[PDB]
Every structure is written in C-alpha cells, then in structure tokens.
C-alpha cells in the first residue's frame, strides 16, 4: 500500500487560503486542514495554533495526540 505526501514547507498561499476559507469549516482538526490544503499535518496543527491568536478558531480539546478546534463559538 500507499504513498501520499504533503508539502512539508510552511508556505505563503495556504495560510491565506485557510483564513479566507473559514466559513466552510465548523470542524477543524490538523488532518482536515492538511487534506483540504497541501499543508503537512504537523504544520497544519501549527497554523491553527497561530490562527487561534486571531480567535477565528476556539479550543474545545487540548488532548496530547491531536487537538480539536471549533470555528468561532460554534460556526
């Protein structure tokens, strides 16, 4: 089986895309963001951590393995 990779460089365009696609999301996790862009999964995660100091995304989990973000209060 399988072979799939994502961009492992932190990029311009994908960060901008993220923040301006924001009404689409109500569920945000690293994996989702990674798939919908070409951002890594690791650097999916990190982009969210940055994003949360706009506060267009709100923490509702903080688990070690992976985290779950909401978009705004509830959407």
């Amino acid at each position: 089986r399988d072979k799939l990779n994502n961009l492992v460089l932190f990029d311009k365009a994908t960060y901008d895309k993220l923040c301006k696609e924001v009404p689409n999301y109500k569920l945000i996790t690293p994996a989702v963001v990674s798939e919908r862009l070409k951002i890594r999964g690791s650097l999916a995660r990190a982009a969210l951590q940055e994003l949360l100091s706009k506060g267009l995304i709100k923490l509702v989990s903080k688990h070690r393995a992976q985290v779950i973000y909401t978009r705004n209060t509830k959407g």
Partner: protein, 137 residues
C-alpha cells in the same frame, strides 16, 4: 508561513523540509538520528524546525561541530570509530569516507586472513550464529 530560507547542503545531499532537522540530515552516512540531534543541541539550533527553514549560517555551524567533535565536547564514546585502526585517534567518519574505511577493514583482514575477513569474503555469516536455514530465502 515562512518559505524563504530553503535548500541547505550537508555533505553531498540536498536537505529540505521533509522531517525535523536531525532526521533530515541522516541522508548521509556516518550521521545517525542520535548524532545529528546532539550536533544541533551543541550548535544552539532548535531541531523541531524544518530544513527548508534556517539559513546557510546554521548549516556551517553544524558542519564545523560534527567534524571537530572533541573540540566542542562531543565525547569519544559517542564516535563511530574509537581509536580506529587507521589513525591513532578517535575520528568521526562521514559521507563517502565511511564507505572507504569499511572496504579498507574488510580487505585488511583478508590479508591478515582473520576469521571476520575470510567469512565475509566467502559470503558465510561472520557472526557464529545460525545460518542453517536463514541468511537466504
């Protein structure tokens, strides 16, 4: 969201974002995961970052510390060859130069006709362990 810094050379391989710095370096021989991790800690570089991040500066600082290990307090035990057989020191061997020495040692013990040498040359298993139904399919 910083591109900008990208395409770094460690020795003879192009090092770009893929994995954390440490792991990224280990394309070359003579640098394992542990080696590259400890070089970065010595060189005061955050190793969680990518190798498409960080400039040329940081790379050179890593290269100097790896190839002068003792003179930057990477101890002797940590080295791939300790006391060596060619060289009276304690040398870290990197890149293509590891392949050289491996060849050297195998030829060396074929001359000297030591058991290790002979077994390896003939294709028999150098360790004394079973090869009865293993070491093939």
């Amino acid at each position: 969201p910083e591109k900008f810094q990208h395409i770094l050379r460690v020795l003879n391989t192009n090092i770009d974002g893929r994995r954390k710095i440490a792991f990224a370096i280990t394309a070359i021989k003579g640098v394992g995961r542990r080696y590259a991790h400890v070089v970065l800690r010595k060189a005061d570089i955050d190793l969680t970052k990518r190798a498409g991040e960080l400039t040329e500066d940081e790379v050179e600082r890593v290269i100097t510390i790896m190839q002068n290990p003792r003179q930057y307090k990477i101890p002797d035990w940590f080295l791939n060859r300790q006391k060596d057989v060619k060289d009276g020191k304690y040398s870290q061997v990197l890149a293509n130069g590891l392949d050289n020495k491996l060849r050297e040692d195998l030829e060396r013990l074929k001359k000297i006709r030591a058991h290790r040498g002979l077994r390896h040359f003939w294709g028999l298993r150098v360790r004394g362990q079973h090869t009865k139904t293993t070491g093939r399919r």
